[PDB]
Design an enzyme around this catalytic site. Structure first.
Site, PDB file in Angstrom:
ATOM      1  CB  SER A  60     -26.648  53.991  13.627  1.00 32.95           C
ATOM      2  OG  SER A  60     -27.159  55.094  13.344  1.00 32.95           O
ATOM      3  NE  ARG A  84     -22.814  37.761  29.829  1.00 30.56           N
ATOM      4  CZ  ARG A  84     -23.199  38.161  28.622  1.00 30.56           C
ATOM      5  NH1 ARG A  84     -23.115  39.138  27.901  1.00 30.56           N
ATOM      6  NH2 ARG A  84     -24.511  37.638  28.229  1.00 30.56           N
ATOM      7  CB  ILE A 138     -24.073  42.318  29.018  1.00 32.73           C
ATOM      8  CG1 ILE A 138     -25.463  42.942  28.600  1.00 32.73           C
ATOM      9  CG2 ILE A 138     -23.470  42.874  30.306  1.00 32.73           C
ATOM     10  CD1 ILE A 138     -26.549  42.132  29.057  1.00 32.73           C
ATOM     11  CG  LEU A 139     -18.295  44.708  27.382  1.00 34.44           C
ATOM     12  CD1 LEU A 139     -18.147  46.134  27.110  1.00 34.44           C
ATOM     13  CD2 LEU A 139     -17.447  43.953  26.753  1.00 34.44           C
ATOM     14  CG  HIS A 168     -29.623  53.518  26.405  1.00 27.68           C
ATOM     15  ND1 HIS A 168     -30.012  52.253  26.218  1.00 27.68           N
ATOM     16  CD2 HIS A 168     -30.856  54.314  26.737  1.00 27.68           C
ATOM     17  CE1 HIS A 168     -31.005  52.046  26.682  1.00 27.68           C
ATOM     18  NE2 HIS A 168     -31.769  53.264  26.955  1.00 27.68           N
ATOM     19  CD  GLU A 212     -19.720  44.687  37.915  1.00 26.34           C
ATOM     20  OE1 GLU A 212     -18.375  44.769  38.409  1.00 26.34           O
ATOM     21  OE2 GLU A 212     -20.448  44.069  39.063  1.00 26.34           O
ATOM     22  CG  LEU A 254     -31.638  62.183  12.092  1.00 28.02           C
ATOM     23  CD1 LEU A 254     -32.539  63.272  11.469  1.00 28.02           C
ATOM     24  CD2 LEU A 254     -30.811  61.638  11.110  1.00 28.02           C
ATOM     25  CB  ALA A 255     -30.508  63.211  18.820  1.00 29.75           C
ATOM     26  CD  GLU A 256     -28.622  56.705  19.016  1.00 27.11           C
ATOM     27  OE1 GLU A 256     -28.051  56.044  17.915  1.00 27.11           O
ATOM     28  OE2 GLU A 256     -29.330  56.078  19.880  1.00 27.11           O
TER      29      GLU A 256
END
Length: 200
Positions: free
Chosen positions: A12, A64, A91-92, A108, A141, A171-173
């Site tokens: 997006s 991971r 998740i890293l 986020h 983390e 739209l804000a993102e």
């Protein structure tokens, strides 16, 4: 600064980032888009933009760490300075996050620290807030807990669904994610030696 964008789906925020980096006074360039899933719409966006792509299937690795090492291999190949997560859904691991400390941003769709986790809209609607928003933060983390760079408040409307609220927050993102990238890419904003966000 040379930028990689990691995606898992539609990406997006990818176009807003691309458009931003192509403006005259930009401190950043998007050099690669990496997805952990094949055939997602975000790859098509990157391909249309003329940006190299790689697909690194997380399901082809035993943990991971091995998966993230494969990501970092590609990042080194492309001499990447900054990583942006645009709907990246894995998740890293600690070592990867540690190596890329102060150099990796995430978007986020809540006003952190409210509604941590991948279903922020559902949480916002269940809680009954009339104000939600989005946050760009450095990746730490602890999931959705890194240092906040920018936020934008977005109203919740009576009768909102996940789909309508999601669109409004997106739209804000599209505004704060490229603005935050530019702040980090330029001299302007840094993760400090004390671990706090510093405006140089």
């Amino acid at each position: 600064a040379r930028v990689a964008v990691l995606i898992s789906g539609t990406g997006s925020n990818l176009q807003a980032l691309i458009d931003s980096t192509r403006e005259p006074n930009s401190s950043a360039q998007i050099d690669i888009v990496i997805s952990n899933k094949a055939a997602v719409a975000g790859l098509d966006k990157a391909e249309r933009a003329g940006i190299p792509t790689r697909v690194i299937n997380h399901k082809l690795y035993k943990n991971r760490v091995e998966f993230d090492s494969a990501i970092d291999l590609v990042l080194e190949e492309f001499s990447i300075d900054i990583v942006c997560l645009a709907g990246f859904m894995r998740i890293l691991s600690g070592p990867f996050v540690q190596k890329w400390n102060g150099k990796m941003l995430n978007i986020h769709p809540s006003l952190l620290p409210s509604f941590k986790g991948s279903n922020a809209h559902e949480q916002a609607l269940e809680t009954g807030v009339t104000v939600t928003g989005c946050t760009v933060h450095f990746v730490a983390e602890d999931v959705d807990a890194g240092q906040i760079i920018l936020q934008e408040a977005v109203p919740v409307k009576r009768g909102d669904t996940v789909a309508t609220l999601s669109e409004r927050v997106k739209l804000a993102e599209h505004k704060i994610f490229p603005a935050a990238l530019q702040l980090v890419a330029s001299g302007t904003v840094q993760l400090g030696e004390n671990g706090k966000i510093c405006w140089v």
